[PDB]
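Rotation project, supervised by the postdoc (A.L.). Task for the rotation student: set up a whole-complex structure prediction and record inputs and outputs verbatim in this book. Inputs entered:
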Amino acid sequence: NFVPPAAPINIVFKAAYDLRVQWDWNRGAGANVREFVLSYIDSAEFVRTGWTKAQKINVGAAQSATIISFPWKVEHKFKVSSIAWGPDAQDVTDSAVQTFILNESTPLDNSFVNETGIEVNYAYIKGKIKDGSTWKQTFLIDAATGAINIGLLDAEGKAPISFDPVKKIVNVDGSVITKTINAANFVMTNLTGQDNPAIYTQGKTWGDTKSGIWMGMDNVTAKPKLDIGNATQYIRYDGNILRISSEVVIGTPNGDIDIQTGIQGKQ
Amino acid sequence: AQSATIISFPWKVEHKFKVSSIAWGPDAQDVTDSAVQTFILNESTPLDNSFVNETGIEVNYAYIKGKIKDGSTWKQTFLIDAATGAINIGLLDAEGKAPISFDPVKKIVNVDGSVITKTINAANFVMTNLTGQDNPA
Amino acid sequence: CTIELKDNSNANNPWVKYYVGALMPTIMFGGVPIGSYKVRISGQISLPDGVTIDSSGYYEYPNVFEVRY
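Outputs recorded:
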């Protein structure tokens, strides 16, 4: 039973030519969102066909979207679809279609134009957000080093995602989701002061009724731990003692049989 | 990418070009090179302006977006949001999906493929089931 | 035996149990904060009756040490 992600609750509009669309997203006990897509088509084209050959704009799970040079006095329709990591059948949920047309009666809100900021410099490429009287760095791209910090800076200055070709390292704080990973050394690390490095199936804990695998270092008791199997049939190992619930077989029949000659019995 | 661009190539000057092929593997055969082919820019060389139309780079205070013309329409391939630095890469297939993206707000980097690294230092090698039909291992 | 701990840097802190198990020549445990601690050790032995358990007067190491960080 996979619960698809919940579509954005509401849509608002801001205009300047340029048109901005931002959608609020709230979710509970549902699939987490990983990407947001907006599709915009002309209303007449929508009547002719349903969202087919409709230009789409994709964002990295950012609520606000910007359309530059929107058609003037032309009807349009939009939908915002949340994207999750589930199966294709319920991977994506789309919001309710909302029509919209640029009109002389629509108030012009140019505040969003000033509230952001980007700059192209020989030294780097940098994006900023206007916060009161100051500007906060969003992402940086240095010229001397191919370092790309992504995300609003922490109060202590810790960037969420960091890169370093100099050390040939890709540094990401948080989580990484990939279909597969190929490597030569899965060296688990106790990155935090009190972390517990381990490899396991999601939502599995040692000495638990779940049916997963758990392997890692238990910093609480400072001993390695292991568990493979369900609640009843399992291979559970603690540094002090090992327990194997399931039936165990050692060797194979005729393991030490003479190859040149067989065996037999007679009376 | 299968193509490359050289901006402001010198005119009336000969040049020689080789195309490498780098792959994961032993250092001895880590790379493979294309056949050497020289070129010259001259009136005898026909000019093809077709390639200018397809590519497109959009830079704005709001964001930086790269776009490609397909069927006489811009198609977004990667976007760099100026606000919050939301980044997604790759062409959109069927419903808009970017194979690679980074979410600083949720501190999650999403990849729709494989990641290759000599070493990985992670404190939780959680073995999830994403598609739901593939048993993870 | 059960082993308790208390951060001695502050004037008064509540003793906290961190290890419960069989008494051994050497005891290993982790998952403790960084502050300097005082350690008391007590042993509990079960009387033939399941309910009643005989404990010990808490013995405390005179030395006080910081957790090896």
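Student's summary: The CA atoms of residues 20 and 63 of chain B lie 33 Å apart.
Supervisor addendum: The first helix of chain B runs from residue 50 to 54.
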